Amino acid sequence: PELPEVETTLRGIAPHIEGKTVEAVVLRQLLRWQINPDLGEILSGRQVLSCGRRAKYLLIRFQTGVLLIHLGMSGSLRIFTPSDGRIGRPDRHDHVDIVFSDGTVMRYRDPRKFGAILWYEGIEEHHPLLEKLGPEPLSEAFCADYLYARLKAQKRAVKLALMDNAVVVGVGNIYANESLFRAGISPHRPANRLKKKECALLVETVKAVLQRAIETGGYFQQEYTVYGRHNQPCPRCGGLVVKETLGQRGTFYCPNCQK
DNA sequence: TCCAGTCTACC
DNA sequence: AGGTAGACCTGGAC
Ligand SMILES: [Zn+2]
User: Fold this and answer.
1) Among A42, A76, A139, A169, which one is most buried in terms of CB atoms within 10 A?
2) Measuring CA to CA, how many Å separate A118 from each of A94, A100, A132?
3) Of all nucleotides in the shown strands, which has a C1' nearest the CA of A72?
4) Distance (Å) of CA A133 to CA A130, A157, A209, A221, A248
5) Using an 8 Å Cβ cutoff, are A104 and A84 in contact?
6) Measured between alpha carbons, how far is A24 from A105 in angstroms, rounded to an integer?
7) In the complex, which nucleotide's C1' lies nearest to the CA atom of residue A113?
8) Residues 31-90 of A with CB under 7 A from strand B
């Protein structure tokens, strides 16, 4: 999932687990990194006081420590209310249940197991995976002035820089492809060759694209302008969308509307 | 057959 | 260092 889906996941679990208290934790497997056995002993009786998100990580907080959950490329987190009989029917990819004092179940699912469930004891801001991340794309800190300045010593394709978590978090393959198209910029443009006006447009397109996706999250449908539309018509010029490989990632764009 | 986040590793 | 590729693993689309 990318940042819209993680933010929508966050907004879905929080009203369902925050005030509540953990009673058991089921571990049908133990991902990219190993899970901690006796996580149930760790969390039993501990109230949730907050959930949160940083980059594509979810954060479940207690007074004793922080649970970090990453969905990777195919992970899901879902709530089952006590009356929901799907509690009794987990599939082979439903690796973890987090069961609350009231019967509510939070279920983590992840077929390829690229996600992570990690338990951490110290200061949130110092976690090794969160410490060196760049700014939030929907924060004031991700501005045209920062971006133009961060990009001056980078010769690399701007798509690489825009997908770099040290430059800005959360802009994955889909929304980097869509923002670069909507801003009119080739993904192959050297990052330091974006003009200041172009970095201001790319910034506001990222913010707009990501925000609309957070709210959105037989008949003709088309979510995307270029992503996953190899060899189909560009919605602006009608020309064919090309797909290339840039930084090991599928890169879709129109060479006519993007320079 | 090949397509679909990020930590590690080498020149 | 910056730039590259490999590593993880499983399901579904031509
Ligand atoms: Zn076009």
Assistant:
1) A169
2) 17, 19, 18
3) B5
4) 6, 20, 21, 35, 21
5) no
6) 10
7) C9
8) 32, 55-56, 70, 72-73
Taking the centre of ligand 1 as the mean of its atom positions, its distance from the CA of residue A208, in whole angstroms, is 20
Q: What is the pairing mode between strands A76-80 and A66-70?
A: unpaired
CA A156 – C1' C2 distance (Å)?
10
Q: What is the full DSSP assignment across A107-163?
A: EEE-TT---EEEEE-S-GGG-TTTTT----TTSTTS-HHHHHHHTTT--SBHHHHHT
Which of A39, A230, A82, A206 lies closest to A135, judged by CA?
Answer: A206
Whole-number distance in Å between A151 CA and C7 C1': 29
User: In A195-216, which positions are buried (b, 16+ CB within 10 angstroms) versus exposed (e)?
Assistant: eeebbbbbbebbbebbeebbee
**Contact (CB, 8 A) for A158 and A151:** yes
Q: What does residue A13 show for φ and ψ, rounded to 5 degrees?
A: -85, -35
Give A206's Cβ-side CA count (13 Å radius): 28
Q: Is A16 marked as binding a ligand?
A: no
Residue A82 CB partners (closer than 8 Å, separation 6+) = A102, A103, A104
Resolution of the experimental model, in Å, one decimal: 2.2
- Edge to edge, what strands does the sheet with A66-70 contain? A50-54, A57-61, A66-70, A116-120
